[PDB]
Structures are given as C-alpha cells and as structure tokens.
Amino acid sequence: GFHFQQYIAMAGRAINPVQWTRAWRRMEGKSATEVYRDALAWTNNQFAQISRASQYRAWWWQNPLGMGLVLYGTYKAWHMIYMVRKQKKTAQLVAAAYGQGGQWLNPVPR
Amino acid sequence: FGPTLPDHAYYGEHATYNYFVLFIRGMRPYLEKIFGDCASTIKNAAVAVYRPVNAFVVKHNPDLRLQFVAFASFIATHMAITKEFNDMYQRLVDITSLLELQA
Amino acid sequence: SMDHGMQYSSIYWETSHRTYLPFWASLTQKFSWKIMDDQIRSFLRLPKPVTTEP
Amino acid sequence: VSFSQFFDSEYFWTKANVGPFFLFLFTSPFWY
Amino acid sequence: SAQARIDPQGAATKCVKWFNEWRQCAWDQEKMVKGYNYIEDRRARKHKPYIGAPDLQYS
Amino acid sequence: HLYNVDSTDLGSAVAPVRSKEQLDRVADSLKADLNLPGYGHIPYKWESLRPNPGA
Amino acid sequence: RFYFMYMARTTFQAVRPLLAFSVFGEVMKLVLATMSSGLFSFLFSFVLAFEVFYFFLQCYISYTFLTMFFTVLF
Amino acid sequence: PFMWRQRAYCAPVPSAFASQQGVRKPLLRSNSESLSVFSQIPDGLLGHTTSVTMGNSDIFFLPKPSNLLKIALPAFVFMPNLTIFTRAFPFYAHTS
Amino acid sequence: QFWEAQFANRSFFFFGNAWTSAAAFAFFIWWSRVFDPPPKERLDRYWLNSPKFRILSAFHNPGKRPGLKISLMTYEARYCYRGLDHPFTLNEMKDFLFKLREQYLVNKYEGIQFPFVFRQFNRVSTPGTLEVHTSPALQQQPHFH
Amino acid sequence: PLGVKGRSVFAGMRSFIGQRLGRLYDSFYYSQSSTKYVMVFLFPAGIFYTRFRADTKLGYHVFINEEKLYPDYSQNYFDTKWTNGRKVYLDDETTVEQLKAQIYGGKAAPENVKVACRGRVFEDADNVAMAVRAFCKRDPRLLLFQDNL
Amino acid sequence: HEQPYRAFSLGFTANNLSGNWGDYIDRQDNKNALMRPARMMFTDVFIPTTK
Amino acid sequence: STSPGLAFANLTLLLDVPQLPAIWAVNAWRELNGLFTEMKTLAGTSDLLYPSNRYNPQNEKTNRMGRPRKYNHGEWMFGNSY
Amino acid sequence: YDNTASPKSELIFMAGNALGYCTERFFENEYGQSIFMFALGLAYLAMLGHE
Ligand SMILES: CCCCCCCCCCCCCCCCCC(=O)OC[C@H](COP(=O)([O-])OCC(O)COP(=O)([O-])OC[C@@H](COC(=O)CCCCCCCCCCCCCCCCC)OC(=O)CCCCCCCCCCCCCCCCC)OC(=O)CCCCCCCCCCCCCCCCC
Ligand SMILES: CCCCCCCCCCCCCCCCCC(=O)OC[C@H](COP(=O)([O-])OCC(O)COP(=O)([O-])OC[C@@H](COC(=O)CCCCCCCCCCCCCCCCC)OC(=O)CCCCCCCCCCCCCCCCC)OC(=O)CCCCCCCCCCCCCCCCC
Ligand SMILES: CCCCCCCCCCCCCCCCCC(=O)OC[C@H](COP(=O)([O-])OCC(O)COP(=O)([O-])OC[C@@H](COC(=O)CCCCCCCCCCCCCCCCC)OC(=O)CCCCCCCCCCCCCCCCC)OC(=O)CCCCCCCCCCCCCCCCC
Ligand SMILES: CCCCCCCCCCCCCCCCCC(=O)OC[C@H](COP(=O)([O-])OCC(O)COP(=O)([O-])OC[C@@H](COC(=O)CCCCCCCCCCCCCCCCC)OC(=O)CCCCCCCCCCCCCCCCC)OC(=O)CCCCCCCCCCCCCCCCC
Ligand SMILES: CCCCCCCCCCCCCCCCCC(=O)OC[C@H](COP(=O)([O-])OCC[N+](C)(C)C)OC(=O)CCCCCCCCCCCCCCCCC
Ligand SMILES: CCCCCCCCCCCCCCCCCC(=O)OC[C@H](COP(=O)([O-])OCC[N+](C)(C)C)OC(=O)CCCCCCCCCCCCCCCCC
Ligand SMILES: CCCCCCCC/C=C/CCCCCCCC(=O)OC[C@H](COP(=O)(O)OCCN)OC(=O)CCCCCCC/C=C/CCCCCCCC
Ligand SMILES: CCCCCCCCCCCCO[C@@H]1O[C@H](CO)[C@@H](O[C@H]2O[C@H](CO)[C@@H](O)[C@H](O)[C@H]2O)[C@H](O)[C@H]1O
Ligand SMILES: CCCCCCCCCCCCO[C@@H]1O[C@H](CO)[C@@H](O[C@H]2O[C@H](CO)[C@@H](O)[C@H](O)[C@H]2O)[C@H](O)[C@H]1O
C-alpha cells in the first residue's frame, strides 16, 4: 500500500464541483473505452509500483506483518465507516417498523 | 462345477484407458460440431441485434458526455413512470389501510 | 400521558448480523403489474371479475 | 434443402448448420 | 368444567376455541350440502422441493 | 319497509371508473371522518439525498 | 450402515472448528461480560491466546481428516 | 345457542342494545365476527399482495490474482466417479 | 480449458476434484430447482418469517409498520394458493388483532413508543424542563394473615 | 470422416441402440445369478410400485378410539394385531362404508361405528376424499369411534 | 408439514441459535442473565435510552 | 472411485436414480389423464369438469362434493339447475 | 394422534425427505444464496490453486 494521502486528495477533488465542469470539458472527444483503459492503467501502475518497490524499499509503516497490516487496516476502516453506518440505519429502521429484534422473531404460533 | 464366469465379469476396467473416456474421445468431433453451431447461431443473433442499436446510438450520441446524458435521462424517465404507477397502487393501499383503521 | 413518549428501550445491532441491503437500495423502488394488467384487460376486453357488478 | 438430403449423415455433419435444430431440441420442454 | 356460571369470562377464554371449530364445521357442512367448489390452478413448477422427494397427494 | 334503506336509490348499476381524483377524494373523506392525529407521522426515515428511500 | 457412520464422522470433523470458534467463544464472552477488575483480565488474556492456538490446532486436525476422507484413488 | 349469559363471544355488540342507529349499515352484529379477518375490512388486493416481487442484489465478482500464488491448493470431490467401475458401484460404494 | 478437461481422464463434468469439476457442480446445483424461490403455496413456510423479507418490507415502506400487511399476505398464501378455507388459528387471529390495535394506537397518539406499542425511535420530543421523580410504591393489597 | 452418404442419422441411432441392448444382454448373461435378478427386477419393481403408489394415490392415517372396536386380525398372517396410526391408501371413489369394510375385513363390524376427522363426523354415504377436502384439508387423520349418544 | 419454520443463521461470525427473541406479542431477551448487564459489548452500534 | 466424504452423494444416488423411471411414469400418467379429461370435456358433459382438480363426482344426481343435489326431483323450465 | 406410522417400504424416501427438508429450510432462501456463493468460492479457489 501507498499514497493514501493522494487518494484522499483525489476524493476531495472529485467531490469538488468545479472539477465536475473541468471533467465535462475534458470529456470532449473521448470514448468510454479510453476512460476505462486509463482507469485500469492507473490501478495497474499503483499495483506495479508496489510489486517493484517492495523488493528494496520500506515504508514508515513497515512491520513484521508487512503490507498485510495496512490492507487489514484499509478493510477495517471501510467496514467501520460504511458497513457499520448501514447497520445503524438498518437497526433504526427495524426498531421503527417491528421493534428491536423484529427481524429475528419466531413465526406466529399455530 | 468349475468356473462359469470370465475374468472381465469381475475385474475392473483399465484405469486410464477406460470405456467412457474412449467413447467420449470418439464423440468429441460430433459434440464440437453441435456446440460450435449452437454458439455461432446465438452469437450471430446477438450481433445482428447489437450492431444496429450501437449504430443508432452512436449516430445520435457520438461522444461520451452525450452518451452519459442519454443514459441519465433514460434512468430518470424510467424512474418517473415507475413512480406514477407506484403512486396509483399506493393510493389503493392507503384506502385499504384507512379502512383497517376504521374497523 | 401516552403521546410523545421517551425512548424506553435501547436500539442496537448485534455484531455480524446481516442487513441484506446494497448501496443502491435507496434508488431501488417497488412496482406492481396490477395497474398495467387492468389497463390491458380493459383494452383487450378480457374477462372481468364479478365485483364489477354491484 | 430437402428433409432427406438434410438428415443425410454427410451433409448433416459436414455442410449443414445444425445449430437451430439442436437448440430446438434442447428447448423442447419449453415449447411443450 | 370451567364453571362458567361463576367465572363466565375465564371460561369463555377456554371455550371460544371449540366455538370457532364449530363455526368452521358449520361452513364445511354447508359447502358439502350446497356444492361449492373452485377452479384449482395447475401444479406449480416447484411443487416438490427436491426431485427425489415424494409428493404425497392430498384431496 | 322491507329493506334497510333511507331512499329508493341503491346506487349505480355499474362499478366506478378508476380515477386518481376519486381515490384522493375518498381517502381525504376517510381521514376527516377518522380524525386521527398521527397519520403521516414518520419517526425515522432512512438518511438519504432521496426524499423517499425505497418507495 | 457404513454410509451413516461415514457421514457422522465427516460432519463431526467439519464442525469441530465451528464448535471451537463458537461455543468456547460464548464461554469467553460470558467471562468478559462478568469480569471487571484488572488482575483477572491480565490472567484471562492468556486464556484467550490459548483459545486462539486451540482453534488453529482443531483446524489442522480437521484439514488432515478431511484430506483423508476426500481422497480417491481413481 | 344454550348459555347466552355465559357465552359473550356469541352475543351482540353493545351498539345493538341501543335502539338507535342509499343502503344503511346493519343494525344487528355479533362479537363472533371478531374471529374473521375480512368481516369488516374489504378483501381488496387479497390475491395480489404476494405478486409484488423484488429482485435479489448479490454480485458474483471477485478478482482472482494468481500471480500472488505459486502453490496448488486442495480441492473437494463432490460426486463419485460413475464413469469408471459403473457396474460395481452399488457393491463397492460402502468401502474405503 | 473447460472443454479440454472433459476429455481428460477423471475430469468429466462434475466428477473429479478439478476446478472444472467444481464449476460444473456449481452450474448443476444452479440448473437444479433446490435454490430457486419457493412458490406462493409455500411462502409462509419460511419466507414470510424471514429477516431479509422483514427488513426489505420495512425499508421499502419507509415510515410504516408492515406487520399487518404481512399477516394478510400469510392469510393469502394459505387461502388462495394452498386451498385452506380457515388459514388462521386462534393465535394467528389474536396476532392480527394485536397488530390492528397497534396500528390504531400509532395513528391515534403521535409519538407513542415501546411500553404501549412495540416501537422505538431516538429523536423524541421532550418538554424542556423534564422532572425526575421516584415512582410510588406498589399498592398494598389486602391479604389473609 | 464424419458420416457416410446414403446413410441416415436415424439408422445410426438404431444401430447404436442395438449395440447397447446386445451389450446389456451379454453383461446380464455373464453375471452372478445371486445378485443380478434381484438388483435388476425385484428392487426396481418394488421401488417403482412404492413411488407410483405414493405419488399417484392418496393415503390416510387411520386410528380407532377404543380397543373393543379393534378388528380381529388373529387369523391373517404378517399382522396379528391392530396398530393405530395406520397408513391406508384408497381410491378417489372410495366411500366410508367401503373403508369400514376394508378395515374390518368384510366381517360384521360393531354397531353405530362412525368416522371423524378433526372432530367432524362423516356420513356413511360420503366420498372420503371430498369429505376430507371439506373438513380436514391436508390433515387426513381419520378416527373410528362409536356413536351411541 | 403445515407448521412453519424458524429462520436459520449460522456462521463463524454470528448465529441465531444462542438465543430466542420470542413471538411478536410474547417477546423475551435473547441474552441470558449473566451477560444482560453487558449487552453493549455484544453490539456494533448502540443507541441508548432517553432519560 | 468413492470415499467416506461421499457418503451423502452415494446414498442420494442409490436411493434416487432408481426412482427416476417411476417419476417419469407418473408424469406420463398425469399427461394421459389430462388428455382423457380434455377429450371428455370436448365430447360434452352435463355439469362442468374442473381440469386441475383431483376428483370430479358431479353428475345429474350428485353435487360437486359427492352429495346428492338438493331440489333435483322435478324438472325446470330453464333446463339443468346448474 | 402423533403416532402416525408409515409402511417400512417408504424408507427409500429417507434421502429424498432429507433433501426436501434442507431445501425448504435452507436452500431456497437467503442462507441458500450464501451456500451457492460458497460453492462458487470453492470453484474460485480450485481455479486459483491450479493457476
Ligand atoms: C483516531 C485513530 C483511530 C481512527 C479510527 C479507528 C480506525 C481503526 C482502523 C485503523 C486503520 C488505519 C488505516 C491503515 C491504512 C494505512 C493508513 C496510512 O498508513 O496512511 C495514513 C496517512 C499517511 O499517508 P501516507 O500515504 O503514508 O503518506 C504520508 C505523507 O507523505 C506524510 O509523510 P510524514 O513523514 O510527514 O508523516 C507520515 C505519517 C506519520 O504517521 C505516524 O507515524 C504517526 C505519528 C505519531 C506516532 C503515534 C501515533 C498515534 C498517536 C498520535 C496520533 C494520534 C492519531 C492516531 C493516528 C493513527 C495512525 C498512526 O503521517 C501521518 O499519517 C499523520 C497521522 C497523524 C495525524 C494527526 C492528526 C491529529 C488530529 C486528531 C487529533 C489528535 C488525535 C486524537 C486522539 C486519537 C486517538 C485514537 O495519514 C493521514 O491521515 C494523511 C493525512 C492527510 C492530511 C489530512 C488533513 C489533516 C487531518 C488529520 C487526520 C488525518 C486522518 C487520520 C485520522 C486519525 C486522527 C483522528
Ligand atoms: C481465511 C479463509 C480462507 C478460505 C476461504 C473460505 C471461504 C471460501 C468461500 C468464499 C466465501 C463465501 C462465504 C459466504 C459469503 C456470504 C456473506 C457475504 O458474502 O456477504 C457478507 C457481507 C454482509 O453485508 P450486508 O450488510 O449484509 O449487505 C449485503 C449487501 O448485499 C452488500 O453490501 P454492499 O453493497 O453495501 O457492499 C458493497 C461495497 C463494495 O462493492 C463494490 O465496490 C463492488 C466490487 C467492485 C470491486 C472492483 C473495484 C476495485 C477497485 C480497487 C481500486 C482501489 C484503488 C487502488 C489502490 C491501490 C493501493 C491500495 O460497496 C460499497 O461499500 C461502496 C462502493 C460503491 C462503489 C462500487 C462501484 C464502483 C467501483 C469502482 C470504484 C469507482 C469509485 C469512484 C468514486 C466516485 C468518483 C466520482 O457482505 C459484504 O460485506 C459485501 C462486501 C464484502 C467486501 C469485503 C471486503 C474484503 C474484500 C476482499 C476479500 C478477499 C480478497 C482476496 C484477494 C482478492 C482481492 C485482491
Ligand atoms: C484512502 C482510500 C480512498 C478514500 C476515499 C474513498 C471514498 C470516496 C468517496 C468520497 C465521496 C464521499 C461523499 C461526500 C459528500 C457527502 C455525502 C456522504 O459522504 O455520505 C456518504 C456516507 C454517509 O451517507 P448517509 O449518512 O447515509 O447520507 C446520504 C447517503 O450517503 C447517500 O444518499 P443515498 O443513500 O440516497 O445514496 C445511495 C447510493 C448513491 O450512490 C450510488 O447510487 C452509486 C455510487 C457509486 C458510484 C460508482 C462510480 C461511478 C463510475 C462511473 C464511471 C464508470 C466507468 C469508469 C470506471 C471504470 C472502473 C475501472 O449509494 C451511496 O450512497 C454510495 C455512497 C458510498 C459512500 C462511500 C463508501 C466509501 C466508504 C469509505 C471507504 C474508506 C476506505 C478505507 C480508507 C482508508 C483511509 C486510511 O458517508 C461516507 O461515505 C463517508 C465517506 C468517508 C470517506 C473517508 C475517506 C478516508 C478518510 C480516512 C479518515 C481517517 C478516519 C477514518 C476512520 C478510520 C481510520 C482508519
Ligand atoms: C436439522 C439439522 C440441521 C443441521 C445444520 C445443517 C446446516 C445447513 C445445511 C448445510 C449444508 C452444507 C453446506 C456447506 C456449508 C455452508 C457454508 C456457508 O454457506 O457459509 C455460510 C456462512 C455465512 O452465512 P451468513 O448467513 O451470511 O452469516 C452471516 C454473515 O456471514 C455475516 O457477515 P459478516 O458481518 O460477519 O462479514 C463477514 C465479512 C468477512 O470479510 C473478510 O473476512 C475479509 C477480510 C479481508 C481483510 C484483508 C483484505 C486485504 C485485501 C486488500 C485488497 C487490496 C486493497 C483494496 C481495498 C478494499 C478491500 C479491502 O464478509 C465476508 O464474509 C466476505 C466473503 C466474500 C469474500 C471471500 C474472500 C475469499 C478469499 C480467499 C483467499 C484464499 C487465499 C488462500 C491463500 C493460501 C495461503 C498461501 O459462512 C460464514 O461463516 C461466513 C464467514 C466465512 C468466512 C470467510 C472468511 C474469508 C477471509 C479471507 C481472508 C484471506 C486472507 C488470507 C491471508 C493469508 C495470506 C497472507
Ligand atoms: C437434449 C439435451 C441434450 C443435452 C445433453 C447432451 C449433450 C448435448 C449434445 C447432444 C447430445 C447427443 C450427441 C450425440 C453424438 C453422437 C453423434 C454420432 O455420430 O454418433 C454415432 C452415430 C452412429 O453413426 P453410424 O455408425 O451409423 O455411421 C457412421 C460410422 N462412423 C462413425 C464410423 C463414421 O451417428 C449418428 O447416427 C448420430 C447419433 C446422434 C444423434 C442422437 C443423439 C443421441 C442422444 C439421444 C440418446 C437416445 C437415442 C435414442 C433417440 C430416439 C429418438 C426417438
Ligand atoms: C445427475 C445424475 C448423475 C449420476 C448419473 C446417473 C446416471 C447413471 C447412474 C449409474 C450408476 C448406477 C449403476 C449401477 C448399475 C448396477 C446394476 C447391475 O450392474 O446389476 C448387477 C449385476 C451384478 O453382476 P455380478 O453380481 O455378477 O458382479 C457385480 C460386481 N461384483 C463382481 C463385485 C459382485 O450386474 C450385471 O451383471 C448386469 C449389469 C448389466 C445389466 C443392467 C440391467 C439391465 C438388464 C437388461 C437385460 C435383461 C435380460 C433378461 C434376460 C433373461 C434371460 C437370461
Ligand atoms: C463436510 C461434508 C459436506 C458434504 C455435503 C456434500 C453434499 C453432496 C450431495 C449433493 C449431490 C447429490 C447428487 C444428487 C443427484 C440426485 C439424482 C439426480 O440426478 O437428480 C437430479 C437433480 C436435478 O433434478 P431437477 O431439479 O428436477 O432439474 C431441473 C432442471 N431445471 O439433481 C439435484 O437436484 C441437485 C441436488 C443438489 C444437492 C444439494 C446441494 C448442496 C450444496 C453443496 C455445495 C456446498 C459445499 C458442499 C461441501 C462440498 C463437499 C465435497
Ligand atoms: C449445529 C450445531 C453446531 C453449531 C453450533 C452453533 C452455535 C451454538 C450456539 C451457542 C451454544 C450456547 O448457547 C447458550 O446456551 C443456550 C442456547 O440456547 C442459551 O441459554 C438460554 O436458552 C436456554 C434454553 O435451552 C435456557 O435454558 C437458558 O436459561 C437461557 O439462558 C444461551 O443464551 C446461550 O449463550
Ligand atoms: C406419452 C405421454 C407423454 C410422455 C411425456 C410426459 C412428460 C410430462 C412431464 C412434463 C412436466 C409435467 O409437470 C407437471 O405435470 C402435469 C403435466 O404433466 C401438469 O399438471 C397439471 O396439468 C395436468 C394436465 O395434464 C393435470 O392433469 C393436473 O391435474 C395438473 O396438476 C403440470 O402443469 C405440469 O407442470
């Protein structure tokens, strides 16, 4: 893993509306195949940088588990930021519709 | 009274050169013909359906921005019509719920 | 003293319980073929239910 | 093309297009 | 048995089930006397959950 | 005198025609007759840019 | 009867890790819910680590028995 | 129809004892109607509520990076090979 | 690759332990019926009491309580598609009436919550000066001895 | 070289079926008499009968209220005593009288014997299938009792 | 064959067999007595009461 | 060949593949019964026949549930009472 | 009423009834979708190991 700060900055630029107009202008004379190939090439460049530079270079976060810990941290951040938020919303929804635990209730007895 | 059965009646066939593998390797050509013809038919049909549509779309939306605009407008129109139908059904359901409240 | 009551029980989600909702669920919406079916029946003169007769 | 000269082995396995025939054969339950 | 003379509500709480069964039997007897039936739909494609399962026939 | 009616008109001999306006009218009449404070109240709504998530 | 014996053995060897992960986990969770002090927690951390090692041991055993039970000559 | 003061579920509603109220609503109703679902409420949309369907939402996609791996992995056997020793299968299936 | 494996020994369709065998077994169980949705005659066996079903119904009816409509869907599944003239027993009838009463109370009293109806929500309306007092002791009832 | 001129794929199918049948006959001939007859005729036949009866006919679980009403199965073999809960397969035209006679072995049955399902008495001149459909839908458990009252 | 089934959930992460939530009317706490005071510890999110 | 882990599949096969002929026979019998019912319907019937129903006992002297028809002793100007 | 015996010849329906129960309870619902994904994952892992 690497360039997390650059990724945050990319997300910021993406949400900035002015960049929406800039991208609208850049998309003049452009194809979906070209856009897809460019994105795929960017991702491949990132992963190739990793594969090459891990052989001789060590980041500030280097540890006896290597990039496994950084990847687990990315996963855990994604989890706590998105999935647990969705769980909170679903919990409030279920509590308003059926009551807390309503989705695990037993079938009506016959 | 002696043996009445031969050896092949009991012993298992060859492990690597067996009846079914020989049979299927003999049938391979006919199966190739069959499945290739079926796949070619399906592919030709799909292509005859896709080429004119892609042409008619690119003829009117040759650029990526225009294609995205058309896709978004299609999504919006679909959602709006679905919303109209759903509003009607929701009015029916609301009447039923009001009658339940009245009961 | 029954209206506008306080939250009397706690709301929570147990660990690793599933939600069954994707990220486009809010854009998803329901639909019934009943309205279209009624229109089509009326247009094609298909058998009507007896509930049409009082 | 005639029924007999189509279902002849040579023409059926060399020159004919049995794609539609075998597709209909596979989908028979649907049509029934 | 539940002493409805002195506990009518408590006893009805126990006997309403037999009352409901009697109601159902009344409807059943009426529909058998006056021939009342309905068009049943064809058999569903997945009437059996598993092909090897037996489809016990019910009247 | 043999029937439980106020007048001699027992209504139309044909069912009504589907109409958004008639549906709204009937619903409003029922709401007014019920007079229930709490109809339409939404204690929790799924947080979304869309006004009605789902429906 | 051999089919029933075999399926019983297979299911037991397949669920062994699930048991080690779920029921002993419930026990650990009871202990966590009941304990408050620091000395007992210091001593219980090692029990948790032992449960980790025991889970891995059960997984190894199950892998062995399953590769034995799903090995076919032909 | 035997123990009226003891069987209140089969008795008229209290609005019937009141002697006051196109077509009008019935004057006599029983409490036994509470044992029916569609007694008072209508049967509208009765057999059409199980027809409102919504599709599933699972996506079957997972990148398969094999350049990361250099060893084989174990694989299960799902069915017995009936293409070999077909005639003896019922006789040797119980062995190991 | 998959086609070539068919003619190799021990890798025909779902026999063997190759990847092609796993893929063909997956396609076979998909082509089978066991993983298809149940019919209307069988919905109330598992589906109508399912967490996925309940959560989806609640989500797609944002500010409503679908317990009553679910009871009615069960009644339908049993009456109109299985042939049962009496789908509800006494317990199911009581459950239906309970849900009806809860609907009435929810639409009658604005903001009613758990103790009186099975419902909880966080954003509540409070007076502004909320007093806290101890409840009175339970009423002494007369008893023998 | 696939196929030959003048020959038909149907002729090929016929030849293949002939080959298969001849091979089957040869393999059945050169086999053990202890196993082949059983595995090829008796298990298939019994399985076929059972599956067909279950998937075609409709059965009922019969019970009897009192022991004094049990039939006399002392003579007939393989069943020397009545057991409640017995599965009985019947035809769609069967009546309550025919069922009673089948239960009591065409012999003199007790007096005022009647059939019930879920507490509901059947008439003797009633079709069992339709009576069950009406009274106990998908619960065919029948009970034989004595109606003196 | 006419009685309905209860939902099934089983995995390495969660299940629905260690407890019972009850019916829609007659409900019961799914956690047992020893861990009810520590219910917070068995949740990914917890929204407390208003008091 | 086989193995202990394949006991499920072995049992399922041994107990199910012999039933497929009977299943196909049941399907064929159902088709033939439907064909005969439709032929009879085309020929004609006093009272209707429910196709997908198990049993149809209705006739001139029997209800659609196996009971005698009420009010069927005399004759009616409009013909059949059904 | 629950002593409903059945002919001993119907023991051949053992596996059929087992699979039918497992279908009505697990396979034709969300847990069955999870099981299908598990099978797809077995295929995925076999392919990964071969490569
Ligand atoms: C709160 C933590 C808990 C989070 C939630 C729980 C989640 C649990 C799951 C955890 C998963 C972790 C994700 C792992 C994936 C890999 C991530 C990664 O390695 O790269 C991260 C990324 C590093 O990017 P990079 O690609 O490695 O490039 C490095 C640059 O070249 C720069 O080069 P450099 O050489 O100059 O420095 C290299 C590196 C150096 O990083 C270090 O080595 C750490 C230095 C101190 C050592 C001790 C660390 C712990 C104690 C002090 C720090 C407290 C904050 C916790 C930081 C946790 C991460 C170590 O720089 C940093 O990462 C700075 C991080 C510290 C920012 C402090 C901001 C303070 C605001 C919060 C108030 C104070 C804390 C409140 C108490 C919180 C208690 C939990 O760090 C950033 O966050 C970038 C920030 C960009 C500017 C954003 C605007 C400022 C906002 C500040 C907050 C930024 C977000 C951090 C949130 C935490 C603070 C609230
Ligand atoms: C140790 C054991 C080993 C043996 C294995 C044994 C097991 C074998 C059998 C297999 C296992 C079967 C077990 C049964 C499964 C049943 C349970 C289940 O599956 O669901 C439970 C679980 C329950 O969730 P739930 O609450 O019930 O909700 C269920 C919903 O249906 C689903 O919830 P959802 O829809 O909300 O979640 C989907 C999620 C994720 O969905 C997706 O993203 C779609 C997937 C696309 C993947 C390809 C894109 C990758 C992009 C990477 C590029 C990043 C930058 C590069 C940086 C490089 C440096 C780091 O969506 C989001 O969170 C937001 C993303 C929205 C955007 C997605 C579309 C755009 C994609 C392109 C990005 C464009 C960004 C533009 C931004 C806008 C700018 C204007 O389901 C999930 O959590 C679903 C997500 C799971 C993700 C797990 C994260 C780890 C993934 C890695 C897995 C391992 C990888 C191995 C190596 C291969 C990768 C290298
Ligand atoms: C470092 C890695 C990169 C980080 C950046 C990744 C995030 C990029 C997205 C940025 C945009 C965010 C939007 C901001 C505007 C406000 C909206 C909003 O935020 O609400 C969304 C949500 C809350 O939503 P809500 O409260 O329910 O209310 C409205 C709904 O959201 C919305 O209303 P709705 O429900 O009606 O909308 C429904 C539908 C609307 O959307 C859709 O229908 C579809 C959207 C998908 C579009 C797909 C792209 C389209 C592509 C078209 C082109 C295709 C062809 C070309 C591409 C080919 C591909 C090869 O679905 C969605 O809403 C999708 C929303 C997805 C949310 C983002 C999921 C990512 C979560 C964070 C992942 C963190 C990874 C680890 C970070 C590691 C850092 C150490 O909140 C967030 O998502 C939070 C985002 C936070 C980003 C954090 C970045 C890392 C910073 C680390 C800080 C350190 C502390 C963190 C703790 C852990 C430390 C270790
Ligand atoms: C009456 C009698 C009845 C008796 C009972 C009968 C029972 C019924 C009949 C049974 C019939 C038998 C049928 C068979 C049994 C059925 C089993 C079944 O269906 O399952 C149901 C059951 C689930 O059903 P359920 O109802 O949905 O349960 C609730 C949910 O599961 C709850 O979900 P959750 O909230 O807990 O969330 C879980 C979460 C869990 O998510 C995770 O665990 C992922 C964590 C990843 C962290 C690190 C990711 C780093 C990747 C970074 C990528 C680049 C950056 C991109 C950034 C974004 C992505 C981070 O989501 C997932 O599960 C994702 C799964 C999909 C992805 C699978 C990935 C497979 C990859 C395999 C890799 C193989 C490598 C081999 C290398 C060998 C060594 C050389 O199965 C489970 O137990 C679920 C858990 C399964 C475990 C999966 C763990 C995979 C972890 C892979 C880690 C790889 C790392 C390797 C590192 C080592 C090398 C350094
Ligand atoms: C319908 C769903 C099927 C899906 C699963 C099956 C896989 C899908 C692919 C098709 C399956 C069939 C492939 C057959 C390949 C054999 C081709 C061949 O040439 O074989 C040699 C035969 C014999 O040829 P021949 O010996 O007469 O002359 C040629 C001689 N040589 C080979 C030396 C040159 O050729 C044929 O006549 C064609 C036979 C195939 C046509 C029949 C299909 C068989 C499947 C049905 C089995 C039941 C048969 C009875 C049917 C009765 C109909 C009323
Ligand atoms: C998705 C489904 C996938 C699964 C595949 C499903 C389709 C394929 C399933 C096949 C697997 C099951 C195959 C098991 C076959 C076992 C049957 C068997 O072999 O029989 C036992 C006998 C046993 O013979 P045996 O006892 O001598 O030896 C058996 C093995 N040992 C030596 C170990 C004991 O087999 C035969 O000898 C004959 C077999 C061929 C005949 C098959 C039956 C048809 C016979 C018709 C001819 C009738 C002629 C009558 C003439 C009378 C006058 C003489
Ligand atoms: C830890 C031990 C776990 C072992 C569990 C593994 C179970 C393996 C058993 C499943 C295979 C059994 C073979 C059944 C064949 C029955 C005879 C037959 O040919 O019937 C065909 C019949 C298809 O007929 P139709 O449905 O009518 O087709 C309609 C087409 N639209 O086949 C079937 O029904 C498919 C049967 C599905 C079996 C159940 C699937 C269980 C899921 C297992 C995968 C999960 C992983 C299992 C662990 C792997 C163990 C090696
Ligand atoms: C298929 C079996 C293999 C997979 C195992 C799946 C996980 C097993 C579940 C956890 C086992 C322990 O479960 C634990 O004991 C029972 C479970 O009913 C519960 O105990 C609770 O229910 C029982 C009912 O029998 C009551 O007697 C008890 O008073 C009550 O506290 C506990 O709340 C739970 O913590
Ligand atoms: C030589 C005879 C024909 C041989 C080929 C037989 C193939 C039959 C299997 C096809 C699948 C049948 O699966 C199912 O069974 C019968 C038709 O058979 C139908 O069953 C339904 O229609 C038939 C009419 O024939 C009615 O008799 C029956 O009461 C009704 O339930 C179902 O609608 C169908 O879904």
Coordinates of C-alpha atoms in Angstrom, one line a residue, chain E residues 14-23, chain J residues 118:
Chain E
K14 CA -61.2 -21.5 27.3
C15 CA -64.3 -22.4 25.2
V16 CA -64.0 -19.9 22.3
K17 CA -61.7 -22.4 20.6
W18 CA -64.4 -25.0 20.4
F19 CA -66.8 -22.3 19.3
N20 CA -64.5 -21.4 16.5
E21 CA -64.2 -25.1 15.4
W22 CA -68.0 -25.3 15.4
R23 CA -68.1 -22.3 13.2
Chain J
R118 CA -60.6 -33.1 13.3

